Design an enzyme around this catalytic site. Structure first.
Site, mmCIF file in Angstrom:
data_model
loop_
_atom_site.group_PDB
_atom_site.id
_atom_site.type_symbol
_atom_site.label_atom_id
_atom_site.label_comp_id
_atom_site.label_asym_id
_atom_site.label_seq_id
_atom_site.Cartn_x
_atom_site.Cartn_y
_atom_site.Cartn_z
ATOM 1 N N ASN A 1 3.508 1.567 7.337
ATOM 2 C CA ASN A 1 3.719 0.594 8.435
ATOM 3 C C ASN A 1 3.384 -0.834 7.954
ATOM 4 O O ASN A 1 2.542 -1.012 7.089
ATOM 5 C CB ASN A 1 2.826 0.813 9.644
ATOM 6 C CG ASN A 1 3.193 2.030 10.477
ATOM 7 O OD1 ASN A 1 2.590 3.095 10.308
ATOM 8 N ND2 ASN A 1 4.154 1.960 11.369
ATOM 9 N N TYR B 1 -7.166 3.877 10.315
ATOM 10 C CA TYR B 1 -7.149 3.916 8.829
ATOM 11 C C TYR B 1 -8.575 4.268 8.484
ATOM 12 O O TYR B 1 -9.331 4.608 9.389
ATOM 13 C CB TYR B 1 -6.868 2.539 8.253
ATOM 14 C CG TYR B 1 -5.450 2.009 8.352
ATOM 15 C CD1 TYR B 1 -5.008 1.344 9.493
ATOM 16 C CD2 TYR B 1 -4.617 2.120 7.272
ATOM 17 C CE1 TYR B 1 -3.727 0.765 9.537
ATOM 18 C CE2 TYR B 1 -3.330 1.606 7.362
ATOM 19 C CZ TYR B 1 -2.902 0.929 8.466
ATOM 20 O OH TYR B 1 -1.661 0.432 8.492
ATOM 21 N N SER C 1 0.145 4.047 3.037
ATOM 22 C CA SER C 1 0.523 3.887 4.451
ATOM 23 C C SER C 1 2.029 3.566 4.507
ATOM 24 O O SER C 1 2.649 3.392 3.451
ATOM 25 C CB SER C 1 -0.259 2.858 5.178
ATOM 26 O OG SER C 1 -0.269 1.468 4.778
ATOM 27 N N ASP D 1 0.782 -1.216 0.000
ATOM 28 C CA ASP D 1 0.000 0.000 0.000
ATOM 29 C C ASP D 1 0.807 1.254 0.000
ATOM 30 O O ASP D 1 1.395 1.660 0.998
ATOM 31 C CB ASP D 1 -0.899 -0.131 1.170
ATOM 32 C CG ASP D 1 -1.791 1.029 1.517
ATOM 33 O OD1 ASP D 1 -2.066 1.188 2.727
ATOM 34 O OD2 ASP D 1 -2.311 1.702 0.640
ATOM 35 N N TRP E 1 2.540 -4.561 9.468
ATOM 36 C CA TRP E 1 2.047 -5.303 10.621
ATOM 37 C C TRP E 1 1.351 -6.563 10.040
ATOM 38 O O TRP E 1 0.793 -6.554 8.922
ATOM 39 C CB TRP E 1 1.025 -4.513 11.484
ATOM 40 C CG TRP E 1 -0.181 -3.934 10.789
ATOM 41 C CD1 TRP E 1 -0.083 -2.683 10.273
ATOM 42 C CD2 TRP E 1 -1.461 -4.486 10.581
ATOM 43 N NE1 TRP E 1 -1.310 -2.429 9.761
ATOM 44 C CE2 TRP E 1 -2.133 -3.461 9.947
ATOM 45 C CE3 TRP E 1 -2.136 -5.642 10.851
ATOM 46 C CZ2 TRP E 1 -3.482 -3.530 9.538
ATOM 47 C CZ3 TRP E 1 -3.495 -5.768 10.471
ATOM 48 C CH2 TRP E 1 -4.151 -4.729 9.824
ATOM 49 N N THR F 1 -6.381 1.201 -2.588
ATOM 50 C CA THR F 1 -7.807 1.534 -2.712
ATOM 51 C C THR F 1 -8.188 1.165 -4.114
ATOM 52 O O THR F 1 -7.449 1.401 -5.072
ATOM 53 C CB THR F 1 -7.997 3.045 -2.432
ATOM 54 O OG1 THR F 1 -7.668 3.183 -1.010
ATOM 55 C CG2 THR F 1 -9.421 3.499 -2.739
ATOM 56 N N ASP G 1 -2.600 5.756 -5.240
ATOM 57 C CA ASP G 1 -2.827 4.739 -4.166
ATOM 58 C C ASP G 1 -3.312 3.336 -4.438
ATOM 59 O O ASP G 1 -4.475 3.086 -4.604
ATOM 60 C CB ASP G 1 -3.806 5.334 -3.209
ATOM 61 C CG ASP G 1 -3.494 4.805 -1.852
ATOM 62 O OD1 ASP G 1 -2.856 3.776 -1.673
ATOM 63 O OD2 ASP G 1 -3.932 5.504 -0.945
#
Length: 326
Positions: free
Chosen positions: A37, A75, A35, A32, A39, A218, A215
């Site tokens: 991060n 988010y 963003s 993505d 996880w 999405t 992006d």
């Protein structure tokens, strides 16, 4: 270079397998560009989403190193909280040694229960990374694991295998013609200035330049509810009882391209891209949404623009290069 292939699920999500630890524990994650991060679900998550997905077990892979830094992250689809940690992450062929990542503790909201992927891998600037956690790419460059400080995205149409993220290289044959190197605006998202949005002889949406983010995380082309209502009746969409933005598929046979001019060059979006023919009917691929708290009225050029355009995100030169695919 690293080659990370991606599964195209119903032309709405695109995710890949990465492995965390030694021996590699296996995870599905979206890649993505909105963003920064990374996880994981870990084994300390008791949420519903967590009974549903692969969970990392710190105990069982021999290179992890624990931290006492927490990670909360909100988010648009909902929120999650976890703890950070360091382990080797196998991604696209590269063993990204000692990458910091989140092991989730809670993940509320049924979005993430139904979501076919486990976690999230962000490819935008470290500025937007919660807890200041080093994003994967940044950590590949800091280690010289890649030769070029850039990565390129290919995104397939029609549910075919083949979407890939080329980590540290560009594959010249994935596009026709030449790349066009547009400059970034704020370095956080892959944000660029959009010069206009025109239907046929007349501008319909950015009459003064709009700001856009590029992006992958999405599926639709989103802009503000105002400009968007304006595009929706232009292409001929209507409200359905349920709430769906219904259009007749005949309109693919009769509607003209919309043109988005980014920094000089006109990029068209044909009707077969922005009107989806699904198993139900044909709906628009333009969605109303209004921008999050820390930013000014964003347009998100999502999966419906990316599918049609080879995009390269050059960290070294703070630019995004774009070219018609194939």
């Amino acid at each position: 270079i690293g080659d990370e292939p991606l599964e195209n699920y119903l032309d709405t999500e695109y995710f890949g397998t990465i492995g965390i630890g030694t021996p590699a524990q296996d995870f599905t994650v979206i890649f993505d560009t909105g963003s920064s991060n990374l996880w994981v679900p870990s084994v300390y998550c008791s949420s519903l989403a967590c009974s549903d997905h692969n969970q990392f077990n710190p105990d069982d892979s021999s290179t992890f190193e624990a931290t006492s830094q927490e990670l909360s992250i909100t988010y648009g689809t909902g929120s999650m909280t976890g703890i950070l940690g360091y382990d080797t992450v196998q991604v696209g062929g590269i063993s990204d040694t000692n990458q910091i990542f989140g092991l989730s503790e809670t993940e509320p909201g049924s979005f993430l229960y139904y979501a076919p992927f486990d976690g999230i891998l962000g490819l935008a600037y470290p500025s937007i990374s919660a807890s200041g956690a080093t994003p994967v790419f940044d950590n590949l460059w800091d280690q010289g694991l890649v030769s070029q400080d850039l990565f390129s995205v290919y995104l397939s149409s029609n549910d075919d295998s083949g979407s890939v993220v080329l980590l540290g290289g560009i594959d010249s044959s994935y596009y026709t013609g030449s790349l066009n190197w547009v400059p970034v605006s704020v370095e956080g998202y892959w944000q660029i200035t959009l010069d206009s949005i025109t239907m046929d002889g007349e501008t319909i949406a950015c009459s003064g330049g709009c700001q856009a983010i590029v992006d992958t995380g999405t599926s639709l082309l989103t802009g503000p509810t105002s400009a968007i209502a304006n595009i929706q009746s232009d292409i001929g969409a209507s409200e359905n009882s349920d709430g769906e933005m219904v259009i007749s598929c005949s309109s693919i046979d009769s509607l003209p391209d919309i043109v988005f001019t980014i920094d000089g060059v006109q990029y068209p979006l044909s009707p077969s891209a922005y009107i989806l023919q699904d198993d139900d009917s044909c709906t628009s691929g333009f969605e109303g949404m209004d921008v999050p708290t820390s930013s000014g009225e964003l347009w998100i050029l999502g999966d419906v623009f990316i599918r049609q355009y080879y995009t390269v995100f050059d960290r070294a030169n703070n630019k995004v290069g774009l070219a018609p695919v194939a």
